Structures are given as C-alpha cells and as structure tokens.
Amino acid sequence: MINAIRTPDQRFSNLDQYPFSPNYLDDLPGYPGLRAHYLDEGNSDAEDVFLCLHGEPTWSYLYRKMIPVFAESGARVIAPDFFGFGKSDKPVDEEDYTFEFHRNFLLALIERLDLRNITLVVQDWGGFLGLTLPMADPSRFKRLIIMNACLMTDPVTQPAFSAFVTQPADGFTAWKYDLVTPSDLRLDQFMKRWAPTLTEAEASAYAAPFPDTSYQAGVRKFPKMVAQRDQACIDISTEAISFWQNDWNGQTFMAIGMKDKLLGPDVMYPMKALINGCPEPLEIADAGHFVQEFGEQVAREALKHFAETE
Ligand SMILES: [Cl-]
Numbered sequence: 001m002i003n004a005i006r007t008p009d010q011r012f013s014n015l016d017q018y019p020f021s022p023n024y025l026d027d028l029p030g031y032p033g034l035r036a037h038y039l040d041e042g043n044s045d046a047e048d049v050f051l052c053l054h055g056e057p058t059w060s061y062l063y064r065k066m067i068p069v070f071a072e073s074g075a076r077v078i079a080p081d082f083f084g085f086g087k088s089d090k091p092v093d094e095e096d097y098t099f100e101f102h103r104n105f106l107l108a109l110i111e112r113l114d115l116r117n118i119t120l121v122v123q124d125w126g127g128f129l130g131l132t133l134p135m136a137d138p139s140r141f142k143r144l145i146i147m148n149a150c151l152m153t154d155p156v157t158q159p160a161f162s163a164f165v166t167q168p169a170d171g172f173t174a175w176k177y178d179l180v181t182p183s184d185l186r187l188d189q190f191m192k193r194w195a196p197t198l199t200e201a202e203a204s205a206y207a208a209p210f211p212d213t214s215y216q217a218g219v220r221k222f223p224k225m226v227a228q229r230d231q232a233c234i235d236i237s238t239e240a241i242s243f244w245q246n247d248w249n250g251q252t253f254m255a256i257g258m259k260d261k262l263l264g265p266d267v268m269y270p271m272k273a274l275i276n277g278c279p280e281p282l283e284i285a286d287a288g289h290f291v292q293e294f295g296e297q298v299a300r301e302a303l304k305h306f307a308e309t310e
Contacts, residue, residue: 001032004083004091007209012087015208016201017064022087028108036105037087038080039063042071048142049115052079053106055124055149056222057179057187059086061205062292066121069299075119080109082125084218086209097221099152099233103129107136116140119306123147123291124263125222132236135243143251145302147291148263150271151237152229158241160270164262165227171261176223185216195290244275251309252278253302257287257294279305 012018026035039060050070052063060079070077081088082102091097106129110118118141122130127149134141155162164172178190187207192198198206210216225233252275256268265283272278282301287294 002034002091002096003093004034004089005215006035006089007087007211007215011208011211015061015205016199018061018205020060020064020067024087025109025112026089028105028112030104030108031083034083034089034091036080036083036089036109038078038109039067041067041077041079042075044076046074046076048075048117048119050075050077050119050121050145051110051115051130052077052121053123053126053130054079054081054085055126055128057085057190057216057219058206058290059209061086061208062290063121063295066292066295066299069296069303073303078109078113078115080106082218084216084221090209090215090218092214092217094217094221094224097218097225099129099225099230099236103132103236106130106133110137110140117142119143119145121145121147123149124289125149128152128226128237131244132240135240135247138243138247141250143253143306144275145253145255145298146271146275147255147298148257148260148268148289150263150267151240152226152233153237153241154229154234157238158270160267164267168261172223172226175262176227179223180220183213185210185213185219187219195288195293197286197293241274246276248276250277251306253305254278254281255291255298255302256281256283257289257291258283258285259288262289 020039023038023040024035054062059081063079067077084090120130131151150161153161188203191206192203284294
C-alpha cells in the first residue's frame with residue numbers, strides 16, 4: 001500500500017556501542033505491512049517506562065548512552081525508530097510522511113504496547129511530535145525529560161518557535177540546506193558537522209540505515225515540515241501548548257545544549273515558561289543540538305532530580 005523499502009540487516013553488523021536487541025511490529029493499525037523497530041530495554045515489568053523519541057536525521061542509536069542509565073535505575077526503556085529511520089521500514093515517497101503520519105504511529109505504538117507511567121524523553125522531532133502526545137491520553141504520562149525541542153505552532157502565537165527557521169543563516173537554514181539539497185547525502189559527514197565530538201565509528205552508525213538516497217525520503221521531508229507547517233500540525237501543536245501550560249501536573253527536567261544554533265536558549269527559555277512546573281534548566285555548555293551525545297550526564301541528573309520528588 002505504502003510503497004516502502006527495508007534496510008539490509010548487514011548494514012548494522014558493525015555498530016559501535018549498540019548491543020541492544022531488536023523488537024519489531026508490523027501490525028500497527030494504519031501502518032499495514034510496515035515494520036517498525038524499537039528497543040525494549042530493562043525490566044519489562046517495571047512500573048516506569050522511559051519512552052525515548054529521536055529526531056532528524058537520527059535513530060534510536062542516539063539514545064545509546066542514556067538507555068543503560070535508565071535501565072540500571074530499574075526502568076523499562078522503549079526507543080522506537082520512526083518509519084524512514086534506523087531499522088524501521090522506509091516509505092519511498094516524501095508525500096507519505098506527514099506530521100500526523102508520524103504522530104499516529106506513536107499513539108499506535110503506545111496503545112499496542114500498552115505503555116503506562118511514561119517518562120517522555122524528547123529532542124528535536126522527537127519533541128515536535130512527542131510534546132503533542134500527552135493531551136491525547138493524559139493518564140499514561142507521568143514525567144518529561146526535554147532536551148532542545150519546542151512546538152510547531154504558528155508564528156503569531158509563538159514567534160520563538162518560528163524565528164530560528166530564517167535566522168541565523170548558519171542555523172536551521174544551513175541545516176535544511178545540508179539535508180534536502182545534496183543528491184548524494186552522506187549522513188556520517190552531516191553528523192560529524194553537526195555533532196563535532198562524534199567518533200568516526202559513531203558517525204557511520206548514523207549513515208548505517210541509508211545505503212543510498214532511495215532510502216532517505218523521510219530524512220528529506222522532516223526539515224521541509226519545519227519550514228512548511230500544515231494546518232493539522234499547527235492546530236495540534238497549538239492545542240498542546242494549552243495542555244502544557246494548564247493541564248500538565250507531572251515532573252519535568254529540562255536540559256539545553258548551549259552550542260545549538262537551532263533550538264538553544266532563545267527557544268528553550270520560552271518553552272520552559274509554557275511547561276507548568278518546569279524547573280531551572282540544566283545548561284550543558286559543551287553540547288550542541290544532539291544533547292544526547294552528552295546523554296549520560298543528562299540521564300543521571302534527570303534521575304537525580306526525579307528522585308528528590310517520588
Ligand atoms: Cl528537521
């Protein structure tokens with residue numbers, strides 16, 4: 001139905017620090033014959049579940065340094081790969097990927113696995129999408145760990161969530177250009193640019209899912225959706241703001257990668273005001289957009305903060 005391709009399994013043979021066993025679902029409702037990959041780590045009977053959402057242009061490999069810390073605390077960790085990314089299947093046409101298409105998969109996943117007592121861990125697209133999930137079923141969400149992310153609202157209601165698209169030239173403009181223009185997109189090169197501390201090995205794990213451009217339709221569409229917000233995304237994101245400001249009563253932990261040109265402090269302080277009860281942020285000076293590459297410190301501090309209220 002949805003024409004999609006699948007990454008050969010040998011592409012992930014030599015992954016660095018990725019000893020997690022795959023789990024798949026190819027029976028989600030709305031996603032017929034599409035196989036989704038996700039990690040299920042720690043005790044599968046734990047009370048607490050960390051749902052780790054990744055963004056553009058990565059996969060669950062991004063949470064590889066946080067996963068073990070959350071699991072050792074006694075929690076179950078779910079880290080799904082969105083369709084078009086990591087080990088999940090990849091639809092071939094960019095038109096298949098929409099805000100709701102990826103949002104509905106997350107609601108499908110959550111219902112399917114029956115996740116409860118969720119600690120939402122988001123960043124980037126993990127957050128554009130994931131911050132709109134709680135209002136759908138408030139009872140399954142109990143905590144949030146938010147790294148550089150915001151809501152894809154309209155420019156008027158929140159200019160801070162729209163300004164970064166145009167300025168500065170070396171921020172989101174550069175980012176989108178690097179991703180949607182090359183006809184020969186090398187994700188290892190892109191990642192080493194955007195996450196200067198990655199080793200060669202780690203950079204190649206980010207390119208691992210895409211043997212050639214025919215596999216990167218989802219990678220291509222995400223930046224375009226930051227640029228061109230459809231009505232449903234706007235409506236839903238706008239309504240999530242209200243949920244965070246007035247309905248949210250859980251615990252929150254915010255961490256900012258201070259070197260981020262995209263969603264750094266001019267985006268995160270405003271986000272911090274809209275999230276009821278959000279405490280002071282943990283500013284990580286050396287981290288850029290991929291805060292998770294400095295993930296062990298974030299996981300440990302968040303658990304620390306969470307223990308001093310539970
Ligand atoms: Cl993007």
